[PDB]
Ligand binder design. Structure first.
Ligand SMILES: [Ca+2]
Ligand SMILES: [Ca+2]
Ligand SMILES: [Ca+2]
Ligand SMILES: [Ca+2]
Ligand SMILES: [Ca+2]
Lengths: 70, 70, 67, 70, 70, 70, 70
């Protein structure tokens, strides 16, 4: 709907999304949940730098978000 | 309406807009949705300085927005 | 009314105003609309050419508005 | 009343005040209106960045305010 | 009451307090009023490092406050 | 539930979590409580900037939170 | 209660706590009051940086708080 841009997050549940953060971080992961604050829960998340690190479950606070690429 | 500046986003649904962000980024895309926080959903979005990177769907958190060119 | 400072924008609708932003930008343009957040819609706007038919400015960026 | 600090602005309506801003600016002008966000309307406003432009009418966003000298 | 920290401000009404600001300023003055945002009204306010800068009445926006010394 | 990202915190009650803060700090501890602001009470908590002290109870203010690793 | 993290502050009333602020300050004193914004009233407070200044009663604005150590 033209007035609910966060509904696009719902269409991406159980896919990999890229959450860009204000501080320049890129957080990629499997979107498990999101709310109207754009808080999100990401499964098996990875931070673009530094790499190698692995996050079974990551809850990202919405206010840190720049944009989400679905 | 002189009291509803965001109604101008409603008249630009499915057009190309440029969202200027507080950090200097320019995001161009087709406006699919917006809410009263100025969250916007941009289809086939593009950010300058990174040309050939393209985002099929970018959900932009309103609090990062400087202004929106319609 | 001494308690409605934003009514000054209502009296400036369809006139040229200058929006000063927190970053030092001066956005000039014709005021079409505003809200209690101080979001504004500016018609035929400039940032001192590069011109914008319609620019919707988010209120939390505003320093002050010259009417 | 001791629970209403912004009533001091009410006692200074139509007098000259100095609005100190977070960024170090000082704005002087005659106080025509204020609200509970500390938004203020200033007539014949001068900013000490230049002492020759008298803005007929300046509306200052309250969240930029450090303090107001009455 | 142990759930109303700002009631301590109430016990300092019409006495001298020091308001520490986020940016490192100290503002001293006689507390006339305060609200739940920690906006405060100060009579005969002085800033510590500007000895001669005197203010008959200063209204301080509370979101600049670090803490208040009573 | 796909609309309740913070329920992942409720499942992590009485387990060890890592709270990443906006300033780069990492706070690690046993999660006893959280709220919809992402305030969290952490028992026997450790700062990686000091991984020797074991604070009996740390209440972290959620507005500082970048993401929590669960 | 697992959804009331600030209740831990209520358990610490009239004991000595240490409030960590975002600017790196540590404020120690006896907790007399708190509220849901994490404003706190600290009696006979001390700041680690300047351990010679007494603060008989300090009201600290919650938005400056990093975490409280109980
Ligand atoms: Ca267009
Ligand atoms: Ca808004
Ligand atoms: Ca306020
Ligand atoms: Ca405002
Ligand atoms: Ca203690």
């Amino acid at each position: 709907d033209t007035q609910r841009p966060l509904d696009a997050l719902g269409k991406s549940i159980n896919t990999n999304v890229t959450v860009y953060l204000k501080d320049g971080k890129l957080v990629k992961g499997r979107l498990k949940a999101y709310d109207l604050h754009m808080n999100v829960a990401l499964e098996n998340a990875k931070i673009e730098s530094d790499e190698e690190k692995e996050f079974p479950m990551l809850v990202v606070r919405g206010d840190n978000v720049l944009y989400v690429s679905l």
